[PDB]
Amino acid sequence: RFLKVKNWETDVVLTDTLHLKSTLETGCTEHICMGSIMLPVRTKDQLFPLAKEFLDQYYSSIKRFGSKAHMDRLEEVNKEIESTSTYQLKDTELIYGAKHAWRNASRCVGRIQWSKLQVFDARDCTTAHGMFNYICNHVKYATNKGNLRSAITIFPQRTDGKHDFRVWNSQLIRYAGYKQPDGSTLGDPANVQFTEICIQQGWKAPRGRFDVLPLLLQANGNDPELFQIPPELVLEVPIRHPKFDWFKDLGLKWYGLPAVSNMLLEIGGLEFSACPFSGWYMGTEIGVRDYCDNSRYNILEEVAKKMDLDMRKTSSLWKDQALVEINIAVLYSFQSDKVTIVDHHSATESFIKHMENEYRCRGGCPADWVWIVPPMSGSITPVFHQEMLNYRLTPSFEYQPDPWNTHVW
Amino acid sequence: RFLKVKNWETDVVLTDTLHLKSTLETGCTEHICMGSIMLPVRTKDQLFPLAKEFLDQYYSSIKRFGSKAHMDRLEEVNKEIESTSTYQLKDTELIYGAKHAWRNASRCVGRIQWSKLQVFDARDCTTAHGMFNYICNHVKYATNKGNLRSAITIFPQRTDGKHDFRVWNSQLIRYAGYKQPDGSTLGDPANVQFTEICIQQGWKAPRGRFDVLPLLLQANGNDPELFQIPPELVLEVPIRHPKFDWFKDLGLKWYGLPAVSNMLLEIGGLEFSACPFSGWYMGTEIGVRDYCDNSRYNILEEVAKKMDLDMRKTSSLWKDQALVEINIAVLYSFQSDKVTIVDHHSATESFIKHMENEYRCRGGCPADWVWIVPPMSGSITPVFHQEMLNYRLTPSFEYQPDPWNTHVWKG
Ligand code: HEM
Ligand code: HEM
Ligand SMILES: Cc1cc(N)nc(C[C@H]2CNC[C@H]2OCCNCc2ccccc2F)c1
Ligand SMILES: Cc1cc(N)nc(C[C@H]2CNC[C@H]2OCCNCc2ccccc2F)c1
Ligand SMILES: C[C@H](O)[C@H](O)[C@H]1CNc2nc(N)[nH]c(=O)c2N1
Ligand SMILES: C[C@H](O)[C@H](O)[C@H]1CNc2nc(N)[nH]c(=O)c2N1
Ligand SMILES: [Zn+2]
């Protein structure tokens, strides 16, 4: 019932009690571990337990548990659900809920930052043009001229499930991908399907390698609509290397603002299906994953060639050498252009400190080791040596089906 | 039931049915995943089912399930258990068992090789001197002048748990570690406690940075005895770098033969508490873990110093740079001396081919992602992108308590 986690580098042992407050299921059983699997409406009856659980933790958090104001709010929400089949969160609850969904995100190494989140309440939004406005304002606020600030914008909650708000983009800012007669892929291969949806809905694709995609926004269950984000709001960084003068000629760039927009925020049983949120990048996300995944920009081969490495045999570690250089360049470029970025050493060191705070202050910290350990140089980061327990707490961010599969036109 | 795994790089989807044969528990529940936890006397009653399950598996593998020989062997083992409380494996069953424990080892990336395992049957062994002789022969056979061959030596099984055979070394070949009065460590800090035991038992320590430890061997529940492996049997590689000529002057070397000696082999309910096994290295085990863990040789700083990397900010990626150079050095050095080694790209690519094969022919391949993914350059290896299912099959290799924690000293 009480669980221990050990760090094998430092011998520090922490005791987890927070897992006993775990609501949702993991995918694992006593017979099988699904730890490495990527992906493993509410009737009146289901909603009240969920609301009570949430309000209890909320009132506890402001040191008012069992107070008249606590009991009063529980009755008010109970009455509202009994009458309307749903309920509305107070601003204070919504903010607490959003901060806690981030605090609970077991796959996020950046959670030391969880209490500094700007929450933009977009529950009064009714159209896609309204959504576009809210999103530009979020983009501009979060970007802050390179001095990035964490933010989330929360559109109206699901009702009967036929009037869903959705941002169809997987992130607010991404690059288009196009299949060519050639048989190869121009731009980002991850976005080929989405790019085609944009085209089939009207978008004039410039057909380049780094074309910022249009937002495709769905309000109130309606057909989604296209908008170009003002370019002056999309802060991009040209990638150069501090030692290699040829690096700029690869013609690489990335965007400054990582902003996930396809997830669902669950607070007190309510479901916010459009809740784009953003922070700032850890360097490896771009340099290792975006640039080097075989199925992404896949640039290792071109870079290795320019370095004049021996690509005859895997054992020369030519991939590993090129990988480090690409990642030095990402960090140097962002740092030179004064755009907030964190390297994997710094971010994992901060996460270990955050785990210790959470264990000391909350009795635990759900973490998914498979996600938390950076995709390069794993064991030279402290997280590699840290046992982590993974479990699901609410409020939470959850995955949801891509809208093009669900939506009826 | 069927469980699917997806490779996110290739979109190849595989279907597991083999998990239906898993008996042991994982540590996980519906409410918690213990996937990153390092470590998550049998009665007759519990023994016959375990024997039967094993012999059914063996007899199926040789295409003799339900034969007279299968039935006679069940009857014979049954009778042996009831009368003597245990039983003895036939040589053939021991071989099959040890190969399968390797095939089932979900933390092992090298399992493409599982069917090529030399099994040395050391069940007639009775003394520590006998164990020493068996282990020297294993070392010489496995080493094979650098052309490494996988092998395992299997000492007598547990009886009442008061008469255990144990190799106290965690690996047959490892370097001493010595804690100095000033709190620094000479040699391998992983081996400090074990080094202290060896010293106390009477080992004369040379006190250098790469002193091969003596074997500390326990037979039949007796107090363990020290033995020095003949140095001519301990193949070592001096580490140098193909471009950096100062690399040699770091004074680094490593041994060629990775040989785990502290695990317990379970076959058909029987427990082999001393079963040292060996293969060949994947470079990262030495270049990443042994050399660069903060709690091991910890050479990153000195290497990066000598490379004149910018060390004042982690964001220069100096550690990552020095890490790649060290790992190039390890593979170059082994290759130059003709000692078998595999790089992490080759080994993971082979593992994925092994895993796909296993899914087709066996219905699955239990794998622990946390261990299988290499400790550098994770996502440029194909295993990073491969979903894996982890479950426990027998025969198996298991952890067991360090023997200095449990041994009853006879004096
Ligand atoms: C402030 C700087 C932040 C850093 C450095 C950071 C770091 C990261 C990284 C490296 C990942 C893994 C992404 C991947 O590999 O696909 C991630 C995932 C995630 N983060 Fe953060 N994060 C930050 C801010 C935030 C914020 C502001 C939120 C929510 C308000 C958030 C919630 C999440 C969630 C829910 C995931 C899992 C996403 C998924 O499953 O695809 N993070 N974080
Ligand atoms: C032949 C070449 C082999 C290679 C390249 C290889 C590779 C590896 C590696 C890299 C590990 C992880 C070690 C660590 O990080 O501590 C490992 C673990 C393991 N291997 Fe292998 N292996 C080989 C042969 C063998 C053999 C012959 C056996 C037994 C017959 C074996 C059984 C195991 C077991 C039980 C583990 C888990 C060890 C633990 O939990 O500490 N492997 N293998
Ligand atoms: C808020 C935030 C900050 C930060 N530094 N990084 C992120 C993650 C963003 C930026 N880089 C990857 C992207 O994550 C979204 C996709 N998450 C991984 C994923 C999940 C399901 C399916 C596919 C897939 F790639 C989000
Ligand atoms: C047979 C074999 C081949 C091969 N290439 N590698 C190995 C593993 C050996 C050599 N390198 C590390 C060592 O692993 C032994 C123990 N594994 C780590 C471990 C397990 C439990 C607890 C702590 C701990 F560090 C074994
Ligand atoms: C199959 C495996 O779970 C998958 O490749 C994971 C591994 N770890 C990851 N870790 C992070 N941070 N992001 C990812 O996309 C992944 N992908
Ligand atoms: C806490 C964590 O499980 C631990 O550090 C693991 C991670 N993955 C590993 N993987 C391998 N191959 N060997 C190891 O020792 C470890 N250590
Ligand atoms: Zn699990």
Q: DSSP readout, B126-148?
A: -SHHHHHHHHHHHHHHHHGGGS-
**Touching check for A387 and chain B: CB below 8 Å?**
yes
Q: Does B324 touch chain A (CB under 8 A)?
A: yes
Cα B209 to Cα B188: distance, rounded to the nearest angstrom: 7
C-alpha B321/C-alpha B319 separation (Å) is 5
d(CA B16, CA B364): 5
- Closest residue of A to B10, CA-based? A295
Q: In sequence order, what E strands does B300-359 have?
A: 341-342
Contact B369 A6 (CB under 8 A): no
Q: What span, in angstroms and rounded, lies between the C-alpha atoms of A69 and A56?
A: 11
Ligand 5 pocket residue status of B385, Cβ below 6 Å: yes
- Contact call for residues A54 and A395 (beta carbons, < 8 A): yes
Residue in chain B closest to A346 (alpha carbons) equals: B314
List all residues 6 or more positions away from A81 whose beta carbon is below 8 Å from its beta carbon: A44, A47, A48, A51, A87
Measured on CA atoms in the order B154, B160, B165, B166, is the torsion positive or negative?
Answer: positive
Chains A, B: CB pairs < 8 Å = 202
CATH 3.40.50.2300 fits A16-123+150-160+264-278+348-372, yes or no: no
Method in brief: X-ray
> What whole-number distance in Å separates Cα of residue B253 and Cα of residue B239?
5
- Closest by Cα among B68, B41, B240 to B157: B41
Is A396 within 8 Å of A105 (Cβ atoms)?
yes
Give the closest residue (by CA) to ligand 3 atom 22. A38
State the Cα–Cα distance between residues A203 and A179, nearest whole angstrom: 16
Encoded tokens for A257: 């603002």
Pairing of β B264-267 and β B270-272: antiparallel
Could you tell me how many helices (H) and strands (E) chain A has, helices first?
Answer: 12, 18
For chain B, residues classed under CATH 3.90.440.10 are: 124-149+164-235+399-403
What does the alpha-carbon distance between residue B9 and residue B12 come to, in Å, rounded to a whole number? 8
Interface of A with B in 23-52 (CB under 8 A): 25-38
Rounded Cα distance between A325 and A308, Å, is 13
Q: Indicate yes or no: CB of B35 within 8 angstroms of CB of A33.
A: yes
From the CB of A282, is ligand 1 less than 6 Å away?
yes
Helix (H) or strand (E) holding B333: helix B318-336
Candidate list A225, A271, A285, A358, residue with the active-site label: A285
Ligand 1 atom 38, closest CA:
A107
Cβ of A144 under 8 Å from any chain B Cβ? no
- Minimal CA separation from B98 to chain A, in Å: 23
CA–CA gap between residue B382 and residue B369 (Å, rounded):
12
Residues in the annotated binding site of B for L-arginine: 171, 280-281, 285
**Calpha distance A235→B71 (Å, rounded):** 75
B361 close to ligand 4 (CB < 6 Angstrom): no
H/E stretch holding B120 = strand B118-121
CA A345/CA A243 separation, integer angstroms: 21
> For testing the chain B interface, which of A36, A192, A316, A372 should be mutated: the one with the most B CBs within 10 Å?
A36
Q: Which atom of ligand 5 is nearest to the CA of B9?
A: 5
Q: For chain A, where do the domains classified as CATH 3.90.1230.10 start and end?
A: 236-258+281-346
Q: How many helices (H) and strands (E) does chain B have?
A: 12, 18
In whole angstroms, what is the distance from residue B158 CA to residue A389 CA? Answer: 34
Q: B358 alpha carbon to ligand 2 midpoint, in Å? A: 18
Backbone angles phi, psi at B4, to 5 degrees: -105, 140
* Domain formed by B236-258+281-346, architecture: Alpha-Beta Complex (3.90)
Instruction: Delimit the CATH 3.90.340.10 region(s) of chain A.
Output: 16-123+150-160+264-278+348-372
Q: Report the alpha-carbon distance of residue B154 to residue B273 in Å, rounded.
A: 9
A321, A384, A389 member nearest B375 (Cβ): A384
Strand partners, A266: A271, A396
Pairing of strands A118-121, A259-260: unpaired
Task: Name the residue at shortest CA distance from atom 24 of ligand 3.
Answer: A38
Instruction: Please check whether residue B53 is in contact with residue B268, taking contact to mean a CB–CB distance below 8 angstroms.
Output: yes
Retrieve residue A6's tokens. Answer: 């050990």
Give CA torsion, residues A316, A320, A326, A329, to 10 deg.
Answer: -90
Q: Under 8 Å CB-to-CB from A206, ≥6 apart: which residues?
A: none
Ligand 2 neighbourhood includes B347 CB (under 6 angstroms): yes
* Helix, strand, coil % in chain B, rounded to nearest 5: 40, 15, 45
The Cα–Cα gap between B319 and A327 comes to 12
Helix (H) or strand (E) holding B118: strand B118-121
Catalytic residue among B108, B198, B275, B365: B108
Q: Which ligand lies nearest to the CA atom of residue B348 in the structure?
A: 2
B254-285 burial string, b = 16+ CB within 10 Å, else e?
bbbbbbbbbbbbbbbbbbbbbbbbbbbbbbbb
Give buried/exposed letters for A185-219 (b at 16+ CB in 10 A, else e).
bbbbbbbbebbbbbeeeebeeeeebbbbbbbbbbb
Q: Which single residue is written with the structure tokens 């690399």?
A: B247
State the architecture of A124-149+164-235+399-403 in CATH terms: Alpha-Beta Complex (3.90)
Query: Is B283's C-beta closer than 6 angstroms to any atom of ligand 4?
Result: no
For the question of residue B254 being annotated catalytic, the response is no
H or E segment and range at residue B360: helix B344-362
Catalytic residue among A114, A254, A280, A318: A280
Q: Can you point out the beta strands (E) in A145-197?
A: 151-154, 166-167, 177-179, 185-187
Residue tagged active-site, from B102, B168, B254, B280: B280
Backbone phi, psi, residue B342, to 5°: -130, 140
Give yes or no: A285 in active site: yes
Where are the extended beta strands (E) located within B339-402?
341-342, 396-398
* A380 contacts chain B (CB < 8 A): yes
> Is A291 assigned to a binding site?
no
The rounded Cα B235 to chain-centroid distance in angstroms is 19
| B24 neighbors B392 (Cβ within 8 angstroms) | yes
B385 vs B381: CA distance, rounded Å: 8
